[PDB]
């Protein structure tokens, strides 16, 4: 157990990347709790398969996020995975949906990270799942999403300095296409996405979890305030 | 008049960088409207001096921002300048203050830009005042502010592609230290800031306005989705170890 005896909280752990992260930390021996909102059956099934603890918390509710983090006690590792996509022509998207995206994708990582730092010991780790779309030229239809993922860069740089004296690192993982419900490897966008990539496949959720596990471990104590891209070199058109 | 016959709306134009932008567009012949929230006397003095129109609108109120942009009619140029700073140790800052910063610095530029594109013609221009702190390693105590300024980068890149078919460009201007009420050139941080710079002075609000004016003009129709830094090369500490 690389993480035996460690307390891990994963926000948004019921499916996809988050569920892969739950499984990895469980396999490595950690005491894992994770949150869900809309996928209760998936959460219960994951808890039964792994022994992790499922907890309802809507990441769009600031005080609920703060409360779940605070009521976890001293955390060793916080992973903020929960995020949503609202895609379409900017002039046709509903403003309330956009603001919900900002609340989940920007506000919740900020407040969860600060709250976690209140009780986290020296050696603590905070990981946020961002996106390579925080760096790249976004396709049409994802401007607010891209903004929310670029927000995490300045957020992590700044919080790294706020948390440095406490012995806590904070880092952002930026995936390219990963095979999940939100980005199925078999979906109709498969061929286009792969035409933009050096490694012509979707990543697997377990690969994101592997990068998270390295950053959360003892070899990464000098790694903080940084964005770590795991994307198959996405963004160049096949010629 | 480089901007004669153009209609300009500046969100947050009562003081500082915003006020310099109002003055520049007025001097260049535009019909200028600008918003204010807390500085009514400054706004009324600026309107009297320039002839620009001062309009109350609180940028923390999404529907009010959308409404002032919408009721402006077909804009030629939108400048989103309004922004706030909330600084201090992250574990001591009030959560409602942080969320207000997000609402002004992130939500408002997005909704204002989208609303402006509804009636803006081909050749239109949208400019957002970001910060070099969207790129640089932030000092302690401005993590949320830095996040709000980095948010604008993905925002502008994405909206550039949404707005491309409409003939509208969108760009972010990223200033370094500029002499304003929020960052006075004679303030106690002067020497430290200049110790981090190649050009050892605060910028003037008029210089930010000059960069905005070039980007808003007809020579910049191929310039969109980009971040334009005007910072005196901020971010490297003065030393003499290479002598
Ligand atoms: N797949 C990809 O290609 C990429 C993904 N990402 C990022 O990875 C992260 C995970 O993505 P992915 O696994 O594909 O997403 P999925 O949509 O497959 O999974 C989303 C997960 O986030 C949780 N979640 C969503 N909203 C909330 C909320 N309000 N409160 C609590 N939990 C919530 C969901 O739980 P529930 O269903 O219970 O609500 C679910 O477990 C996101 O931040 C996303 O932006 C980034 C780049 C690429
Ligand atoms: N000066 C600097 O060194 C730098 C500044 N910037 C950015 O430049 C922009 C202007 O900064 P600066 O001139 O120094 O700021 P100041 O504090 O001097 O002026 C702020 C301006 O924004 C307006 N404003 C603030 N909040 C609101 C609101 N809720 N609704 C409407 N208007 C509002 C203010 O109007 P009122 O008082 O009427 O509310 C005022 O006109 C900001 O976005 C800032 O982040 C970026 C990098 C460096």
Dump the DSSP string for B123-161.
Answer: T-EEEEE--GGGTS-PPTT-HHHHHHHHHHHHHHHHHHH
CB contact (8 A) between residue B111 and residue A102: no
DSSP B104: I
Annotated ligand binding at B9? The verdict is: yes
CB contact (8 A) between residue B144 and residue A102: no
- Which of B117, B142, B158 minimises the CB distance to A138? B158
Q: For residues A34 and A26, what is the distance between their CA atoms, to the nearest angstrom?
A: 11
A-B Cβ pairs (cutoff 8 Å, strict)? 146
Nearest atom, ligand 1, residue A202 CA = 3
Two structure tokens written together for B170: 């969108």
Q: What single string gives the DSSP state of each residue in B43-60?
A: HHHHHHHH-PEEEE--TT
Instruction: Say how many Å lie between the first and final Cα of chain A, rounded.
Output: 46
Nearest atom, ligand 1, residue A208 CA = 8
Two structure tokens written together for A193: 């996405």
Out of A3, A110, A145, A163, which one is annotated catalytic?
A145
Number of structural domains, chain A?
A: 1
DSSP B238: -
Catalytic residues of B: 145
Nearest atom, ligand 2, residue B132 CA = 47
* A103 Cβ closer than 6 Å to some ligand 1 atom: no
B233 Cβ contact list (under 8 Å, min separation 6): B197, B198, B199
Residues spanned by the domain of A160: 1-239
**Rounded to the nearest 5°, which phi and psi values hold at A195?**
-65, -20
CB contact (8 A) between residue A143 and residue B159: yes
Residue B56 gets the label, from left (phi > 0), alpha (psi -120 to 50) or beta, of beta
Q: For residues A156 and A168, what is the distance between their CA atoms, to the nearest angstrom?
A: 12
Angle at A53 between CA A48 and CA A58, to 5 degrees: 115
Sheet holding A7-11, edge to edge: A53-56, A31-36, A7-11, A77-80, A125-129, A169-175, A227-230
- Report CA-CA distances (Å) from A87 to A44, A54, A129, A221: 29, 29, 19, 37
The answer to whether the beta carbons of residues B52 and B46 sit under 8 Å apart is yes
* A177 Cβ closer than 6 Å to some ligand 1 atom: yes
Q: For residues B98 and A109, what is the distance between their CA atoms, to the nearest angstrom?
A: 13
Beta partners for residue B175, in sequence order: B230
Would you call A110 a catalytic residue per the annotation?
Answer: no
The Cα diameter of chain B in Å comes to 61
Q: For residues B87 and B142, what is the distance between their CA atoms, to the nearest angstrom?
A: 5
Cβ count near B125 (within 10 Å): 27
Q: For residues A124 and A221, what is the distance between their CA atoms, to the nearest angstrom?
A: 9
Q: What single string gives the DSSP state of each residue in chain A?
A: -TTTT-EEEEES-SSHHHHHHHHHHHHTT-EEEEEESS-HHHHHHHHHHH-PEEEE--TT-HHHHHHHHHTT-S-SEEEE-------S-GGGS-HHHHHHHHIIIIIHHHHHHHHHHHH--TT-EEEEE--GGGTS-PPTT-HHHHHHHHHHHHHHHHHHHHHGGGT-EEEEEEE-SB-BTTB-TTSTTHHHHHHTBSS-SPBPHHHHHHHHHHHTSGGGTT--S-EEEESSSB-----
Q: 3-state class of B84 per DSSP?
A: coil
CB contact (8 A) between residue A95 and residue B117: no
Ligand nearest to the Cα of A101, by number: 1
Residue A205 belongs to a domain with what CATH number?
Answer: 3.40.50.720
CB contact (8 A) between residue A106 and residue B62: no
Two structure tokens written together for A163: 């948390």
Distance from CA of A10 to the nearest CA of B (A): 21
Distance from CA of B243 to the nearest CA of A (A): 30
* A164 Cβ closer than 6 Å to some ligand 1 atom: no
The answer to whether the beta carbons of residues A79 and A129 sit under 8 Å apart is yes
Cβ count near A220 (within 10 Å): 17
Distance from CA of B130 to the nearest CA of A (A): 12
Two structure tokens written together for A94: 């509903």
* B183 Cβ closer than 6 Å to some ligand 2 atom: yes
- Report CA-CA distances (Å) from A120 to A203, A239, B96: 31, 49, 23
The answer to whether the beta carbons of residues B174 and B231 sit under 8 Å apart is yes
- The method of structure determination was X-ray
- Best of A150, A156, A235 to disrupt the B interface (most B CBs within 10 Å) is A150
Q: Which residues does A contribute to its contact with B (CB < 8 Å)? A: 62, 66, 89-91, 95, 98-99, 102, 106-107, 110-111, 114, 117-118, 133-134, 136-155, 157-159, 161-163, 225
Ligand nearest to the Cα of B87, by number: 2
The answer to whether the beta carbons of residues A170 and A126 sit under 8 Å apart is yes
CB contact (8 A) between residue A162 and residue B89: yes
Model resolution, angstroms = 1.7
Q: For A91, what's the count of Cα atoms within 13 Å in the CB-facing half-sphere? A: 14
Ligand nearest to the Cα of B36, by number: 2
- Report CA-CA distances (Å) from A148 to A105, A142, A152, A172: 6, 10, 7, 13
Q: For B90, what's the count of Cα atoms within 13 Å in the CB-facing half-sphere? A: 30
């Amino acid at each position: 157990g690389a993480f035996t005896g460690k307390t891990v909280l994963i926000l948004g752990g019921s499916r996809g990347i988050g569920a892969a992260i739950v499984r990895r930390f469980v396999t490595d021996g950690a005491n894992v709790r994770f949150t869900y909102a809309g996928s209760k059956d998936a959460a219960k099934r994951l808890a039964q398969e792994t022994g992790a603890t499922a907890v309802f918390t809507d990441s769009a509710d600031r005080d609920a996020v703060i409360d779940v983090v605070r009521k976890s006690g001293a955390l060793d590792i916080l992973v903020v995975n929960a995020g949503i996509g609202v895609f379409g022509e900017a002039l046709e998207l509903n403003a309330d949906d956009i603001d919900r995206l900002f609340k989940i994708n920007i506000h919740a990582p900020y407040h969860a990270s600060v709250e976690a730092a209140r009780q986290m010991p020296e050696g603590g780790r905070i990981l946020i799942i961002g996106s390579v779309n925080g760096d790249r030229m976004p396709v049409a239809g994802m401007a607010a999403y891209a903004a929310s993922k670029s927000a995490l860069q300045g957020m992590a740089r700044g919080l790294a300095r706020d948390f440095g004296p406490r012995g806590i690192t904070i880092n952002v993982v930026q995936p390219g296409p990963i095979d999940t419900d939100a980005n199925p490897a078999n979906g109709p966008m498969r061929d286009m996405l792969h035409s933009l990539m050096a490694i012509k496949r979707h990543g697997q959720p377990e690969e994101v979890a592997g990068m998270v596990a390295w950053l959360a471990g003892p070899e990464a104590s000098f790694v903080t305030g940084a964005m770590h891209t795991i994307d198959g070199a996405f963004g160049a058109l096949e010629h």
